[model samples]
Target chain A: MKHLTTMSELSTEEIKDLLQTAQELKSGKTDNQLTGKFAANLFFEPSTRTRFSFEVAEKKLGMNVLNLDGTSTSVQKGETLYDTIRTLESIGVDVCVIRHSEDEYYEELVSQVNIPILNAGDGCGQHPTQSLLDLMTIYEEFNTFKGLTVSIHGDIKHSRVARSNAEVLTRLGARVLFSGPSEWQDEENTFGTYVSMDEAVESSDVVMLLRIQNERHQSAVSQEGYLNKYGLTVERAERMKRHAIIMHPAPVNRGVEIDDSLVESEKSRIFKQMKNGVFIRMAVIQRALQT
Target chain B: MKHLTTMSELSTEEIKDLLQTAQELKSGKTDNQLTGKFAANLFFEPSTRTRFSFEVAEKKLGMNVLNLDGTSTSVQKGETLYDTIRTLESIGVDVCVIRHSEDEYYEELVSQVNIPILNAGDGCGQHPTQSLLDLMTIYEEFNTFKGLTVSIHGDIKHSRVARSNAEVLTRLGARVLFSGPSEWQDEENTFGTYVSMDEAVESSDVVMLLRIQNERHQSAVSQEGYLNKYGLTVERAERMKRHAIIMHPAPVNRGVEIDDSLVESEKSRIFKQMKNGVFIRMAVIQRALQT
Candidate 1:
């Protein structure tokens, strides 16, 4: 595939191969072969974690990075995305990592450009690096993907990471037990296993906590009410399977999604999830640029 | 002085001597000794021209600069200026070029910190570097400062540049002239001589155009009316005395304060004022940092 804009582009085998490569890259066995290559981070919506991860990965892989901090660009003056892409391509950026609030931004930009575009994110659709890193973290814990039960807790429907991971994990023979407030029910039932949080974790081997984006809630759920009912607390952690690891993609709202103490405990894979984020991004860029 | 916060702190001889030093530095005749030094620009208010000028000055002096784009800072989270300064000091910043909307932010910050703060601007208090740069630009055109008649033509009560320039030019033996609407009459007595734009330009050796901040205006002044009476047109440029140059600290409003043609005309010294801006900032930082 020329770009990993959506999880649908990758087969189950390809996804697993990318995850394996990510693991190797994370172990620091790679060389500076990609020196003089450039990655342009064109973020229309800021994600400090994702942006910095891409920067670190690109730099570690020996590529130059041009981060358009979104201020000095023409978008501030209402310039079109196609024009912005054309201008960026003219500057010889070999790869573009973009994040726009609109889900269709990648599809719009990719059709207009010859260069590779990695969807850092586009609205609620997909953040494939995040998914791959989640998969990597999960695999590291389970030591295998087949037939294991995984519980995805928190706001699942709107989370690109949850959606992407659900698609990938189910295809790899893992059973995902999806749970959150009633607001996150998918419009189409095509991805992860849909189950209640309490019921899901009872049989699950891992609990992945997606962030409760209180700011984006249009549903009937209030933030405080949602936390009380659906948030992952230490009390809830004790009810899960014996070896179940906890996970979150961060700048986490501590004490909201998962208990702060649980995130620091040995069972938490949040830091590992963070560390793996760089590796998966590097792997994605490496494959994406091969076009 | 430990911090170059105001033009009032420097005597006429000191100002001239610093201007001379700035001229020498700008001309590239001396060794740039500020290598390895770092400037932290903590601008709470956006001024692209001033920011770029500071960048150019720091680069010319062989110093690295970290532009703390205020939008990306913790100050957005309601952190106080004192906390921001302490954080910068902790991270090993050498000097700070700060501009804030608050009236006493720079003065208060300077008093609390050991490291020098060069006030790029504070609300209606001072912009010493701009004043010095304006002075240098004037002296360059006239070849002398003795008995020079200079007119500051625009908004007075809210302009720090106007306030500082009024003080600096008067101390340097220039007969300062204020010209705009007679409705702005009270501020004229607060500074020095008052004249109509026509009368001021006719007899003055230099005419400095101060920006009319329409966004900050407390009183009503119609744009068309301001342009008709006080705007620097090509006709106005033609009326100036021989060897008298036009000066403006710019990002000039195309047709509001000055006609675009007059800005591009042979008589305009705005670009020279910008070029001198680099030197003045360098000199100011050097003076502020030296023991």
Candidate 2:
């Protein structure tokens, strides 16, 4: 609960408690326990959703949010993360939320700084907050994660969203399934269950779609063929189970990972996931700061 | 005021009132008058100072800030500025502080949304907030703008800071003098009195240096020659009137606009201007949101 670096850091009771806290905050409960506290959002990577979500969350709990633009900061002038974070601490930052390009970037920071380091994302490593929010979105619908079938589709090899969600959902007793192009699959069986794209969409209680990291692949997958083979097209979405829901950690590449038309369709909770992100982040920030 | 797009929008009394309010806030006055309000910092141009200052200001006033990273937002996905802003408004944004590359970009937005649109900067149009902070810094020292010689030196043709300050300072009874290379001068005689760089430095009560926009010029100025001719070098700063202060809207070109050594010198209020910027922005945001 101190620093959310990985999904493995939370127990089943703790995860459930966080989900309940997120729900409480979302129901219009206002809390300012963190007032007079400061949180520094040090993002070395470019982001639109996660960063903004955290800012909104911190402000909601009455904490001062210091957003450091990575490109223009001392980081661009060759200041190390440790030094930049130390400077923030010196200036009275209570917590540091960091997103960097290097995997496990928070590992170095946790040992150097006494404050909580909430990992927004690090390379293809854990994005624990994203997973927590995703869990909140799913839990809100089903009221339970114990027997739900959650299928994660697309770019499993390079998605921190996929990595964190796979670990957390399986740990919470959900049947975790992975489906994507062969090249993009996690060959290590990291999340255990692997299924066909057809089976994944038709059977899962929750369909989680990851964006295609076109920049990471060594060989290009033709857009048309990839869509036909793995994408959650309008037809695929129509055929999903009556209770199935679709989710994306968005800035969604419309028509690439999921069909443009299906993004906001009845079964899609994409925008709701974004809305829930703010509340979940509030819950997580409160948890991290609590003694 | 519904929107703050230009210095011409404020009377001398209103301008002076804002400066006083900024000074009040800077002197350890804490207010949560803006509690539960949301302000979106939407920048279409790259800015380290303006963006961060507004964020710090918003946080200080107990307002939630949604910072939209222009490079990665729906703008990159072909969403129009109008659409993006409308989205923020729909999501309960009370006021928007925006900086755009196009001159007068806030013009179209003023009619489109009912919420206040505070122009952070608009190309060569105006940067009213920067001018307010500069005036606040000057007024802190002199206690009056009447009959004071405030010399604005450097790239006047392209600086919104120069454009806005020249108008407001002149309106407040300050003798606004223009100085720098003739090519970089405001040929329209925009702020009236033009003076030699030496005279501007030695005689003016407050010497303001503008950053060189090498991108805007048709040809690059020789850095060393430019420094020697127009920059506030150590020698120039030493010969300045005993009570004179130096200021720059920074992310300064260390030795190009002004000598690196003189940037933090005794008479230089460059860093003070930045410090005052946070309070000035808080005042601007408060004024914009007031009924």
Candidate 3:
């Protein structure tokens, strides 16, 4: 668990311990003592929120943030990921937050660098930070992990958010309901539950909206008419319990995945989730750097 | 006028004002008050210098910079620009510096978002920041903007740098000479003298080398013969006035645009331009962000 390459690398207890650490930091019970440290974000993918959250966390801890504009790096000049990681290690980068198109890039890259490699996400495989933060948000809302139901709606097979969150939440003693159009559901239960949207959110404590990636529509399912039936709307939000929070790992599909109002509503933890993303990432970096 | 979507939107005076501000900023001015402000660079095309300059500017000003990687974004998902800007705005980005290869992409993206958009260059239309910075560098060297001779060489037609810098310098009262292989020179440059490379550099007080895009070989003139006659060597640098510093919009072609040694020499202002690039961009963002 030194580097969160995947949630699968952690047993249920270890995941709980990481979540607890994130909670302590988010609740102001912990001070950022990891100063003079540096974390390099090597995202081969374009990320506005996830990357910045890590940056925000590092800067808050008085650490420098080196964001990799992957296109400008030696990667563009045919430098292999191994060489790139080795180069960073030679320059004494303390931790490397990485995301790539290939699902196993984190493990492959980590094998090359002396520093800890945090998986920001790797294609459809895993994004442990998103899982940890989502669990944090849900815990904050429900005030307890046990005996609560949570439904994640939208693209399940392709969403690292859904997969990781379901894995973490189910292990944390929460009832997990996975929901999406039948076409987008993973029948294998690879990450967690596979259930209907209506059944999943019926008595759920939180409704997390995961946007079906329209970019992958050709392979899995179509987003053309799915929003009308499966998407979270103002009408759907009103139908849920008043205390239940709506969450998303954004850049949300505004009109398609959820109505804009529902995202901006009082019950929505989207903005706080984004802000917490910074602190949790900071905690993650601090934990890895200390070890 | 709210956003620098196109240089055509600016009068010659406005461009000069930006350059003047840039020069002042470069000369040991410290106004890091723009801290806490955030800039999201939404580059749909690859321009490392422009991108790095903006990031450096943001960092120097104490502002947060989000270098949005193009690969993992909605662009990868086949999401529309309308959806992309909406998502960014919802996530609370302050300004977006956009670069795209299509005509009017900046304007179109700007029109969709509430935040200001600085066009980092759209297709072949404009790259006002690069133009403004080049003008600032030239003005610094000559002491007077008016009545100085300058030669612009390399890919004249493909270089937004050549086109924009030439126009900005001409407006600042420089006697401009356009040079390259005759085929790449703009046929309708009635404002400046268009001459052969050897003659152009020999008669000028300043020589500007534009980048010869490697991709241009397929559609435009080849790089083979141009390097022989037009490329600046140490011998060429010695031939110019000792005061004439070698100027280039870098990442210079090591052998094709100019010889490697001359670029590494003390007479080369290319690195100075790279350093001043941060200040100039700081001024540009400052001006664009003003009420």
- lDDT for predicted candidate 2 compared with the true structure: 0.83
Arrange candidates by TM-score, descending. Answer: 3, 2, 1
lDDT of 1 by residue, B205-274 (tens): 8888877776766777877667667877778778999888888887687777888788867888889888
Pairs that collide, model 1 = none
Give the DockQ of candidate 3. 0.11
Ranking by DockQ: 2, 3, 1
Kindly provide the TM-score obtained by chain B of candidate 1 when compared with the true chain B: 0.94
Residue-pair clashes per prediction, in order, are 0, 0, 1
TM-score of chain B of each: 0.94, 0.95, 0.90
lDDT of each residue in A174-201, candidate 3, tens digit only: 8778777776677777445666656655
Please, what are the lDDT tens digits per residue for candidate 2 over residues A7-120? Answer: 887898988898889899988988667997999998777776777778878877888778885655456778787888888889999998888889998776787787889998
Per-residue accuracy of model 2 over B75-96 as CA lDDT, tens digit each? 4354357645644653457899
TM per prediction: 0.56, 0.63, 0.68
Q: Is model 2 an incorrect, acceptable, medium or high docking prediction?
A: incorrect
Query: Which residue runs of candidate 1 sit more than 4 Å off their true CA positions?
Result: A1-65, A68-291, B30-32, B72-75, B187-190
